[PDB]
Amino acid sequence: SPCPGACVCYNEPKVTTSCPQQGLQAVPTGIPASSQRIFLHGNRISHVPAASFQSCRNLTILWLHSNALARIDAAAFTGLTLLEQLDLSDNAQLHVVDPTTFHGLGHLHTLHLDRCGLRELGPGLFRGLAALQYLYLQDNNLQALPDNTFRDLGNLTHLFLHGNRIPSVPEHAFRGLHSLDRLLLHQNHVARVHPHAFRDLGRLMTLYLFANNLSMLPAEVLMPLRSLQYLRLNDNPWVCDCRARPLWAWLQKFRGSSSEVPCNLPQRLADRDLKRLAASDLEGCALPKCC
Numbered sequence: 001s002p003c004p005g006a007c008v009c010y011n012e013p014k015v016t017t018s019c020p021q022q023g024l025q026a027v028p029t030g031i032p033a034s035s036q037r038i039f040l041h042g043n044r045i046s047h048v049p050a051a052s053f054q055s056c057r058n059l060t061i062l063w064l065h066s067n068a069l070a071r072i073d074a075a076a077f078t079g080l081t082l083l084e085q086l087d088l089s090d091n092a093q094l095h096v097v098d099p100t101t102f103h104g105l106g107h108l109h110t111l112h113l114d115r116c117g118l119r120e121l122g123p124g125l126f127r128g129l130a131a132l133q134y135l136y137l138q139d140n141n142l143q144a145l146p147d148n149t150f151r152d153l154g155n156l157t158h159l160f161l162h163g164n165r166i167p168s169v170p171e172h173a174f175r176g177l178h179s180l181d182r183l184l185l186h187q188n189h190v191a192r193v194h195p196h197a198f199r200d201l202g203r204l205m206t207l208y209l210f211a212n213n214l215s216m217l218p219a220e221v222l223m224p225l226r227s228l229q230y231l232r233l234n235d236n237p238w239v240c241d242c243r244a245r246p247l248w249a250w251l252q253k254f255r256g257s258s259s260e261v262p263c264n265l266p267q268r269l270a271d272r273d274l275k276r277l278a279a280s281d282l283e284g285c286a287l288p289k290c291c
């Protein structure tokens with residue numbers, strides 16, 4: 001009932017404890033348990049100990065973005081069964097989130113983890129988040145996209161993975177993402193995508209793969225994308241020879257909107273758009289399956 005010194009407390013529209021840009025070193029004590037929204041963004045909170053908000057059982061929105069988060073306890077968010085929105089973004093030194101941290105958050109809808117310097121996504125990190133719809137993981141330091149990382153995210157519609165260093169996409173990286181509408185994998189180091197990586201992405205409408213390291217792409221990887229409407233493949237070292245014929249054939253039938261597919265090789269077809277090429281331009285080689 002009394003508001004912490006660095007905070008503003010009001011009841012409408014939701015019970016809110018707001019303490020942004022107050023130079024707070026840690027989570028302020030005495031936050032009203034009736035709080036539905038807590039805003040602690042813009043401080044210098046470095047650690048989030050266990051049960052830091054356990055008394056706030058009605059908490060649905062928690063902002064911790066733009067702090068100095070270096071360590072989050074695995075039980076930091078226990079008791080927050082009604083939490084819908086969690087923001088931990090803009091904490092470039094966070095590096096690693098404990099795989100148990102998000103467990104039990106069955107009402108979570110949006111999870112902001114953009115710019116957190118995340119080195120990896122540990123096993124079971126997004127386990128049981130069946131209500132999650134928006135997952136922000138851009139501008140981190142990811143080096144892998146392990147199988148079944150998002151297996152339980154059946155309600156996920158937006159997945160942001162751009163601005164990382166993911167080298168490849170394995171077969172079961174995106175298994176279970178039946179509701180996925182937009183998938184942003186641009187500005188990574190993707191050198192190869194498994195032929196069946198997008199098997200469950202039949203409702204996907206937007207796929208960004210530009211600014212990667214793709215020289216070739218099996219046409220079978222695009223086949224499950226029945227609902228695709230937007231595709232970006234530019235800024236990739238595409239090799240426009242015989243190996244590009246399957247991808248070429250698919251692009252000729254694609255009724256959606258695709259970007260340029262710039263040929264890096266051969267020298268003759270440099271920066272020509274692959275989809276705008278004739279079939280005759282795609283003969284001969286320039287190790288692949290057709291040479």
Ligand SMILES: *[C@@H]1O[C@H](CO)[C@@H](O)[C@H](O)[C@H]1NC(C)=O
Binds near residue numbers: 034056057
């Ligand atoms: C949560 O909200 C309900 C309904 O308004 C209320 O009865 C309960 O006391 C609240 N919990 C806390 C910890 O304030």
Ligand SMILES: *[C@@H]1O[C@H](CO)[C@@H](O)[C@H](O)[C@H]1NC(C)=O
Binds near residue numbers: 130155
């Ligand atoms: C997924 O969303 C739909 C509607 O948006 C909802 O009816 C359903 O309960 C959600 N699934 C889960 C597991 O929360």
Ligand SMILES: *[C@@H]1O[C@H](CO)[C@@H](O)[C@H](O)[C@H]1NC(C)=O
Binds near residue numbers: 189213
């Ligand atoms: C693309 O990936 C290959 C390995 O598959 C690697 O040798 C090459 O350096 C990468 N290119 C860039 C620009 O990183």
Ligand SMILES: [Cl-]
Binds near residue numbers: 044
């Ligand atoms: Cl400080």
Ligand SMILES: [Cl-]
Binds near residue numbers: 176200
């Ligand atoms: Cl399945």
